[PDB]
Design a protein around this ligand. Structure first.
Ligand SMILES: [Zn+2]
Length: 71
């Protein structure tokens, strides 16, 4: 159920930040979300193919301030 086992875990795990129940909301909010949705990318094939787990995207340092939604 929604990737997770019907959100039994309850540890707020998602591509963005929230639970799998709120995963569609999270996906809608940022769109990129570790390039979970392939369709988002212009070339279709994104740099990060893998579904974001725990801060998988932007692993190398980009900005000093760590904000999940950073462009
Ligand atoms: Zn997500």
């Amino acid at each position: 159920g929604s990737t997770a086992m019907a959100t039994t875990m309850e540890q707020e795990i998602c591509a963005h930040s929230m639970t799998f129940e709120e995963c569609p909301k999270c996906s809608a909010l940022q769109y990129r979300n570790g390039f979970y949705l392939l369709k988002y990318d212009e070339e279709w094939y994104p740099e990060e193919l893998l579904t974001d787990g725990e801060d998988d995207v932007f692993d190398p340092d980009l900005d000093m301030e760590v904000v999940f939604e950073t462009q």
